[PDB]
Short mmCIF file of C-alpha atoms and ligand atoms in Angstrom, two decimals:
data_model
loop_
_atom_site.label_atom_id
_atom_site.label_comp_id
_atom_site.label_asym_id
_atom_site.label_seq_id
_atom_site.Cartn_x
_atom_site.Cartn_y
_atom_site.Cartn_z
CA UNK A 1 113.43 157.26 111.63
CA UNK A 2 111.41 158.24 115.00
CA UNK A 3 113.11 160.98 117.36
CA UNK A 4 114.22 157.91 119.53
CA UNK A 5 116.66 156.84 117.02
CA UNK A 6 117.34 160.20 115.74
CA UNK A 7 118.71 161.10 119.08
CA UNK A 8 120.27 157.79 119.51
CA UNK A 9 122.15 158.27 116.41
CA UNK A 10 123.01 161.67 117.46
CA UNK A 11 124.55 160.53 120.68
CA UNK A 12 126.47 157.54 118.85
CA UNK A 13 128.21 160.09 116.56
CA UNK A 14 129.29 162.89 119.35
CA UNK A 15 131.31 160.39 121.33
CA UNK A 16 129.93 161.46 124.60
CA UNK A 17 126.35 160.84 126.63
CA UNK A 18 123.46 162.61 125.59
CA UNK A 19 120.18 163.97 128.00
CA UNK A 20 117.46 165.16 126.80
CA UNK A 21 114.09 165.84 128.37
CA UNK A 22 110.89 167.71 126.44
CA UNK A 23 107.61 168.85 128.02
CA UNK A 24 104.88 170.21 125.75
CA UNK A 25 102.30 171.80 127.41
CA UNK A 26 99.55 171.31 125.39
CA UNK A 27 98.78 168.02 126.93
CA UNK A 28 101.96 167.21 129.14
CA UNK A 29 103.09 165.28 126.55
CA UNK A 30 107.23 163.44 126.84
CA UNK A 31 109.93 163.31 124.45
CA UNK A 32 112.80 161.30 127.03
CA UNK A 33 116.41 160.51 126.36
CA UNK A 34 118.16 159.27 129.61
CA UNK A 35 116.13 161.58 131.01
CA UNK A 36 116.55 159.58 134.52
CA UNK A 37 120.27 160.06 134.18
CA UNK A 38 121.98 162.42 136.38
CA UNK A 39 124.12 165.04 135.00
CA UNK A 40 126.44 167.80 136.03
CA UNK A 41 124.15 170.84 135.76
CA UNK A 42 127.06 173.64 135.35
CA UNK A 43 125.97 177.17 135.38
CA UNK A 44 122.45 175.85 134.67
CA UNK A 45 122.18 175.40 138.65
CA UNK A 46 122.26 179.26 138.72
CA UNK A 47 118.89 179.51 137.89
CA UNK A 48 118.09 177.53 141.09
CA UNK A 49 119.25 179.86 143.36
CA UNK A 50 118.40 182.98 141.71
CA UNK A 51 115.10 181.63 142.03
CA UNK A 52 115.07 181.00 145.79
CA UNK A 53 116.22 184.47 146.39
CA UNK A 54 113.16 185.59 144.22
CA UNK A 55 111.36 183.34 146.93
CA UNK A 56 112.50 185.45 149.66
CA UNK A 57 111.67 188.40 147.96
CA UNK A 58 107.68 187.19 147.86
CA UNK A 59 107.65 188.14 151.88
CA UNK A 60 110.71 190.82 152.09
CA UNK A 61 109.66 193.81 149.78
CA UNK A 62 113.15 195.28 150.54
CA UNK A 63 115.78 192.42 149.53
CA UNK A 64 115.82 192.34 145.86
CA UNK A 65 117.20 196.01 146.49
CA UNK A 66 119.21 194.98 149.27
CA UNK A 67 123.05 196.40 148.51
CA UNK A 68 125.87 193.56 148.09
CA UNK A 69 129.38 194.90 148.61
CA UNK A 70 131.99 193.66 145.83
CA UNK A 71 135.39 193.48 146.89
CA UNK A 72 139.10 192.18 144.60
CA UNK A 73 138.80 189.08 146.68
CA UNK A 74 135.36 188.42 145.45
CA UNK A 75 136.28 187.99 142.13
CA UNK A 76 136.33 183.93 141.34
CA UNK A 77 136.80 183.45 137.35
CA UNK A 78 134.98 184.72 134.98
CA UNK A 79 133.20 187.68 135.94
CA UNK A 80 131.79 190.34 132.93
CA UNK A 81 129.29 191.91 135.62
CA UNK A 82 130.74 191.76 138.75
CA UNK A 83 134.45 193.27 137.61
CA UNK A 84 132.54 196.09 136.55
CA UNK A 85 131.69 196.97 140.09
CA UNK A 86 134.28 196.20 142.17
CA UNK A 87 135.10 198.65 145.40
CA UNK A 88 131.03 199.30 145.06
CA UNK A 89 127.86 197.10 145.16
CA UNK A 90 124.89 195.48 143.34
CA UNK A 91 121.89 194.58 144.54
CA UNK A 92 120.32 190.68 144.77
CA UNK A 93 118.53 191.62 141.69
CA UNK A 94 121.02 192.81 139.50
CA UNK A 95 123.42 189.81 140.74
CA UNK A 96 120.59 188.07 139.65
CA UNK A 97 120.56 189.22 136.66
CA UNK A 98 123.70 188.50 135.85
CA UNK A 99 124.24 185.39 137.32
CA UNK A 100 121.44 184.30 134.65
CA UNK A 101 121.87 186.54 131.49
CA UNK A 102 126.06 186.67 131.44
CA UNK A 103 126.89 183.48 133.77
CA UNK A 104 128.84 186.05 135.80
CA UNK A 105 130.15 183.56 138.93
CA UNK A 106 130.66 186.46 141.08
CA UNK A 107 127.03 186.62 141.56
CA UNK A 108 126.59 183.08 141.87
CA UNK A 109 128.58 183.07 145.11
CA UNK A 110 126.96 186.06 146.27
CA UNK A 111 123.11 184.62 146.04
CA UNK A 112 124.59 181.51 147.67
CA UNK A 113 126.58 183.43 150.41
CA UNK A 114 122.95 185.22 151.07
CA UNK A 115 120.84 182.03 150.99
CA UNK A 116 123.34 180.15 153.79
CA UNK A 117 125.43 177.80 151.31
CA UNK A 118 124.65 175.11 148.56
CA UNK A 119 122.56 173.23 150.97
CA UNK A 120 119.93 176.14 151.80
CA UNK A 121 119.73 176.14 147.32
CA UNK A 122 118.63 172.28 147.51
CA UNK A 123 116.81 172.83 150.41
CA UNK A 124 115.07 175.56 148.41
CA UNK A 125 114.49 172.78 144.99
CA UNK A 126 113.14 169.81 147.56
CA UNK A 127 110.17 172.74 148.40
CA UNK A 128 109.31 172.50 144.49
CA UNK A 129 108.90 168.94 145.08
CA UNK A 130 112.20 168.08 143.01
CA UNK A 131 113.78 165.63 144.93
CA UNK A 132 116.66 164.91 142.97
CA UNK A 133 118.97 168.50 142.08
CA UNK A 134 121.27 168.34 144.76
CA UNK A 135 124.32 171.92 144.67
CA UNK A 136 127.01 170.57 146.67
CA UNK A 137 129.90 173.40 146.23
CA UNK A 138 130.50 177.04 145.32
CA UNK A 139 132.25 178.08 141.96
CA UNK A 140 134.27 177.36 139.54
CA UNK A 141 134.70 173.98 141.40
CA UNK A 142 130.81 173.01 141.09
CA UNK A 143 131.97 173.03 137.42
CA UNK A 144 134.06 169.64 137.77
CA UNK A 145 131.61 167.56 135.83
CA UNK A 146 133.30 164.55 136.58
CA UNK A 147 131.70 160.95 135.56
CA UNK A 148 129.98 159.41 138.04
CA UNK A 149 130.88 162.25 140.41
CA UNK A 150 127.03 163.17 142.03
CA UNK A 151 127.91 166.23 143.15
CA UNK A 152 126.34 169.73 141.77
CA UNK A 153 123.79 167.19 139.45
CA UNK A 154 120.51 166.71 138.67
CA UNK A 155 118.54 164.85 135.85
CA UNK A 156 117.12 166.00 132.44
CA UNK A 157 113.58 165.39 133.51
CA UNK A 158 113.62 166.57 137.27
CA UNK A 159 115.14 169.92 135.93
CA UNK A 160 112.51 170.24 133.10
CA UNK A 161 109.96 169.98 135.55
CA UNK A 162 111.50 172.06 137.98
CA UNK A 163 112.26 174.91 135.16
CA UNK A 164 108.07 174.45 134.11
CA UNK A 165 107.05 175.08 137.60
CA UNK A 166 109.53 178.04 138.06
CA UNK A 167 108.56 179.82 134.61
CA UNK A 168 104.97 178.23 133.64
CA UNK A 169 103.39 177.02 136.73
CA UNK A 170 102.79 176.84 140.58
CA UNK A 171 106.61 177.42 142.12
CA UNK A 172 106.62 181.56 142.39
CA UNK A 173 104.15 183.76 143.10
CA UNK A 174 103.24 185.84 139.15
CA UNK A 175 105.26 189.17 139.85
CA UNK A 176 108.66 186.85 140.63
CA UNK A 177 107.49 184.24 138.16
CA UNK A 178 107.56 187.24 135.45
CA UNK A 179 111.00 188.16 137.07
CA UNK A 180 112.41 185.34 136.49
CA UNK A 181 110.95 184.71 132.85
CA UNK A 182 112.18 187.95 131.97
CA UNK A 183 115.52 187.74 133.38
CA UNK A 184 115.63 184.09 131.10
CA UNK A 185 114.30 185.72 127.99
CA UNK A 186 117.33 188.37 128.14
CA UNK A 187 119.91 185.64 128.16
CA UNK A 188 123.24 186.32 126.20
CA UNK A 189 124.95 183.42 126.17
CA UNK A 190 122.54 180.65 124.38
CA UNK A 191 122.69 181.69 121.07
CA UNK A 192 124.90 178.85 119.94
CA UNK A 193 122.98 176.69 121.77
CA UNK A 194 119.18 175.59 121.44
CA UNK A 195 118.20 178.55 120.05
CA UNK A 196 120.48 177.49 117.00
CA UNK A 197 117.62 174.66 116.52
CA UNK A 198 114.73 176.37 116.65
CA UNK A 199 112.48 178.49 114.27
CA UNK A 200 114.25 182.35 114.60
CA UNK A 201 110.76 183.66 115.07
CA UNK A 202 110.35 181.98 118.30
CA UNK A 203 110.80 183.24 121.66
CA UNK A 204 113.09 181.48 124.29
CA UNK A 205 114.66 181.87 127.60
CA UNK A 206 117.52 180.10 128.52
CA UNK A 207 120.35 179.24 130.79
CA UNK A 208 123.66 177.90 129.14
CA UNK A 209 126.04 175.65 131.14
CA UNK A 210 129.28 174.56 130.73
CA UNK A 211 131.93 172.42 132.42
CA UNK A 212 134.93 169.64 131.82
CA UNK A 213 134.96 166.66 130.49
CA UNK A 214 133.39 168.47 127.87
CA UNK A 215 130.00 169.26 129.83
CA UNK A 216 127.68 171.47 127.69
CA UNK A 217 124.09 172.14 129.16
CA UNK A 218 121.39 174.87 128.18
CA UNK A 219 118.14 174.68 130.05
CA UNK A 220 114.79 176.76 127.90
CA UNK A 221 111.38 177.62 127.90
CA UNK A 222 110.11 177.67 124.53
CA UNK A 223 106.96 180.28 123.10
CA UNK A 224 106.17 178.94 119.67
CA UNK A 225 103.90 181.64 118.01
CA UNK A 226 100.72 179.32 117.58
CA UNK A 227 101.25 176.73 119.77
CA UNK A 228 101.64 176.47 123.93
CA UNK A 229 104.75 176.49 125.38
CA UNK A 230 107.24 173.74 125.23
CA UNK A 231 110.14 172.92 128.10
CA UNK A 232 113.30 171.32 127.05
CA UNK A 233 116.58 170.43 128.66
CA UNK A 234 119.75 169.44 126.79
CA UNK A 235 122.33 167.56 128.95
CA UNK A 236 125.69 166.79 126.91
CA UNK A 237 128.59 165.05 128.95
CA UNK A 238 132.38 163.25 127.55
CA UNK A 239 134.66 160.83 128.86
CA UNK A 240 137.82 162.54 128.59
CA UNK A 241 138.82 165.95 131.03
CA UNK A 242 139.86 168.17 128.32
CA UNK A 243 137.31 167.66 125.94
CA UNK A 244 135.83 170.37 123.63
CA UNK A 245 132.61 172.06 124.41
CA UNK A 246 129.66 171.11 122.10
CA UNK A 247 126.50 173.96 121.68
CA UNK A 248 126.05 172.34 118.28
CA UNK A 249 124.83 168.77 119.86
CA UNK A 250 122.55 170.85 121.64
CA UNK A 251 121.04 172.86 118.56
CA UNK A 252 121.09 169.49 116.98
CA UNK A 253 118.54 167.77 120.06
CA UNK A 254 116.75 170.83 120.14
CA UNK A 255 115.50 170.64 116.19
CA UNK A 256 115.39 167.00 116.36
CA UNK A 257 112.56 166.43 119.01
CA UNK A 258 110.53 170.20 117.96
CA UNK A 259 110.47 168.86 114.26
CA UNK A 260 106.49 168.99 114.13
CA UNK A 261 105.87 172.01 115.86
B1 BZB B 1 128.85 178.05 133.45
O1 BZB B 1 128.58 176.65 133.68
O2 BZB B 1 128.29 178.63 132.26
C1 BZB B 1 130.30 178.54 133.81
C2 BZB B 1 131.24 177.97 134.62
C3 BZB B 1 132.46 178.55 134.79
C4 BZB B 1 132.66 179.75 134.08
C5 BZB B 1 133.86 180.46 134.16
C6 BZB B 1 134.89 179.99 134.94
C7 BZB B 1 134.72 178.83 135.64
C8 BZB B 1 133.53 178.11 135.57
S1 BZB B 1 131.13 179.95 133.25
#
């Protein structure tokens, strides 16, 4: 059976809507599965604007140390990092930090307070040339994930692209480009996820992402140990609210379309 039907069969069997979009490097070869189809992106937008603020810190030598008050009020939901520091501060780079490597949504708010709002973050992705991730609110509500809902979404392919030009290519200049990979390599939260289909030897960075209606997401850059790099987004998505989360659908894509690498 080709990976086509392998996914297809995968999809069938999970009872909700499968994305998935593969880039290897080597020779910009595809491996597509309604990878034109938008999705809620979850936490998997916080890459995007931890990345513009690395942006801004290519011609201001002083922000990524610039000092962020946190305050009782601050705290949203979920927040390992940011609870940890209330009545002090953090800088932009250590709310970037963990925005990306413990999904804190503290720091989230905080890199899209500093930007201007979730407009100034698509503003930001349309300068990559991605025309089509669009952040519409703040969190937890960004996390909605409703069908057919195009808020806070973004497509399998446009955000592999994206996440290639961000990590691998021509979006950052190299000293935030190494930021930013190293900030995605020391992710804690993805071991469920891809990672769970891949060779243990390999080296990964990833951001998890996770929603209603059952919305499970983890975005990676893959470093095979004798081979280039590969990109690969997992969108997962259900029909009903209260559905359960699914990592395992996502380890699942993630061997099926790397089994020849
Ligand atoms: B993300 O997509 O990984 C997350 C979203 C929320 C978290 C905690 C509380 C509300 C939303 S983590």
């Amino acid at each position: 059976n080709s990976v086509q039907q392998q996914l297809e069969a995968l999809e069938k069997s999970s009872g909700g809507r499968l994305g998935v979009a593969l880039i290897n490097t080597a020779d910009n070869s595809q491996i597509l599965y309604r990878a034109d189809e938008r999705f809620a992106m979850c936490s998997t937008s916080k890459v995007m604007a931890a990345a513009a603020v690395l942006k801004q810190s290519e011609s201001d030598k002083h922000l990524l140390n610039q000092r962020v008050e946190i305050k009782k009020s601050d705290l949203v939901n979920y927040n390992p990092i940011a609870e940890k520091h209330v009545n002090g501060t953090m800088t932009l780079a250590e709310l970037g930090a963990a925005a990306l490597q413990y999904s804190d949504n503290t720091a989230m708010n905080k890199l899209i307070a500093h930007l201007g709002g979730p407009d100034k973050v698509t503003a930001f992705a349309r300068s990559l040339g991605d025309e089509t991730f669009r952040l519409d609110r703040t969190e937890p509500t960004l996390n909605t994930a409703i069908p057919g809902d195009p808020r806070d979404t973004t497509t399998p392919l446009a955000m592999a692209q994206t996440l290639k030009n961000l990590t691998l290519g021509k979006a950052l200049a190299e000293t935030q480009r190494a930021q930013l990979v190293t900030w995605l390599k020391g992710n804690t939260t993805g071991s469920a996820s891809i990672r769970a289909g891949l060779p243990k030897s390999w080296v990964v960075g990833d951001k998890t992402g996770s929603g209603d209606y059952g919305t499970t997401n983890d975005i990676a850059v893959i470093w095979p140990e004798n081979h280039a790099p590969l990109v690969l987004v997992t969108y997962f998505t259900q029909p009903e609210q209260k559905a359960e989360n699914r990592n395992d659908i996502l380890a699942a894509a993630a061997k099926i379309v790397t089994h020849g690498f």
